[PDB]
């Protein structure tokens, strides 16, 4: 494999704007006035946890702000959607979204516009706050930032209809389903994949609830086990390329994580056995990927894809 440069100059320019304007900036909903405890819900401005988590990390004396939802995270999702676009073309019966459409019904032009929307997806964030109000406020912020940029500078590219749809994709409005639109689905799948870098084996392989399938099981239902595992591996190699910690995987350990043998066996039958070693975060590559679009882009383009990415 070896993906090479997939983003045209227009997309990179937009990445450059989003980095300058949003992703390079300090989180602002931080400090004592944004602490939270369930037992004193209205003691501060926060109505939930997470405002002061992981605001920045120090590398070679330089603060990298918003390391969990910064440039690298965002750029990674563009690479995921590219891979899954091809993956979808290999499926005889792709997943039908609530709009009646599938990933394979997107054109290359659609993919470009989708990628541009992905750049703003977490751009509205003002902290690592996790709870619903914060999540919804921050996605609305990212949606509005997208719209303000698109209406000034991209009207030769997006129709008004398309500005509305992509805005809604970013907004993630309450009542809208994960698979509301094919565009939305692909955006969310891409975000989902990236969570593997910071979740436990339970969320990734087993499901955080009897209802929810789990990240890798989800990739497998959509894409088959072979392509789904390849996608999984690809994402782990993007973690390592951008200097992020790669979690280990051990399917033999799954029965020892306090989950009902029921669900452990289920995941085993879907995923099969996996033993792969994790890897410590690398500060130098973290800096390379976090402080400029070229740094991040040049690290991602290099990484090998599955061979089917490249096939006709």
């Amino acid at each position: 494999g070896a993906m090479g440069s997939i983003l045209d100059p227009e997309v990179l320019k937009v990445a450059e704007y989003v980095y300058q304007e949003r992703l390079s900036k300090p989180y602002t909903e931080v400090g004592p006035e944004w602490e939270y405890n369930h037992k004193t819900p209205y003691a501060t401005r926060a109505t939930g946890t997470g405002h002061n988590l992981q605001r920045f990390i120090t590398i070679d004396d330089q603060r990298l702000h918003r390391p969990i939802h910064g440039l690298a995270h965002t750029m990674r999702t563009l690479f995921y959607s590219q891979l899954m676009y091809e993956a979808a073309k290999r499926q005889p019966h792709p997943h039908r979204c609530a709009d009646g459409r599938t990933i394979a019904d997107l054109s290359v032009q659609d993919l470009k516009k989708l990628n541009i929307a992905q750049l703003f997806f977490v751009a509205g964030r003002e902290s690592e706050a996790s709870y619903g109000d914060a999540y919804h406020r921050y996605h609305l912020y990212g949606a509005k930032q997208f719209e303000a940029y698109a209406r000034k500078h991209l009207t030769h590219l997006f129709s008004e209809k398309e500005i509305v749809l992509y805005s809604r994709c970013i907004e993630d409005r309450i009542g809208d389903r994960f698979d509301e639109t094919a565009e939305g689905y692909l955006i969310h799948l891409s975000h989902m994949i990236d969570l593997m870098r910071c979740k436990s084996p339970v969320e990734v392989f087993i499901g955080h609830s009897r209802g929810v399938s789990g990240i890798v099981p989800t990739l497998i239902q959509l894409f088959g086990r072979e392509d789904g595992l390849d996608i999984m591996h690809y994402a782990r190699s993007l973690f390592a390329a951008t200097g992020e910690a790669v979690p280990y995987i051990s399917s033999s350990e799954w029965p020892h994580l306090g989950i009902e043998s029921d669900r452990v066996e289920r995941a085993l039958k879907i995923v099969g056995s996996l033993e792969v070693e994790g890897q410590e975060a690398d500060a130098k590559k973290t800096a390379q990927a976090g402080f400029s679009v070229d740094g991040c882009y040049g690290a991602l383009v290099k990484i090998d894809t599955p061979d089917w990415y490249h096939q006709v």
């Binding site: 989180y27 931080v30 002061n52 988590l53 992981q54 605001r55 920045f56 990390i57 120090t58 910071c198 979740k199 436990s200 084996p201 339970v202 969320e203 087993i206 955080h208 910690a245 790669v246 979690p247 280990y248 051990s250 350990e253 020892h256 994580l257 306090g258 989950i259 070693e277 994790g278 890897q279 410590e280």
Partner: protein, 76 residues
């Protein structure tokens, strides 16, 4: 008895003690080995973060269970 505590990357520390201990207890134990303050420690089990007060018996932690440990780096 023996349980394992692991970072997401697989760095594993093996612990001795008992169902009787609380999670705050086990976090203090991790402190004494590796020197990590409990306030920075999130222990996971069944993909859900554990609260300091409850015992290992409550989350049914037994022989050779794996708990996961992430370090809350507050923004520093």
């Amino acid at each position: 008895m023996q349980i394992f505590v692991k970072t997401l990357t697989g760095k594993t520390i093996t612990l001795e003690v008992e169902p009787s201990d609380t999670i705050e207890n086990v976090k203090a134990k991790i402190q004494d080995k590796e020197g990590i303050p409990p306030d920075q420690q999130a222990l996971i089990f069944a993909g859900k973060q554990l609260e300091d007060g409850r015992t290992l018996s409550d989350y049914n932690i037994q022989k050779e269970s794996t708990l996961h440990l992430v370090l809350r780096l507050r923004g520093g």
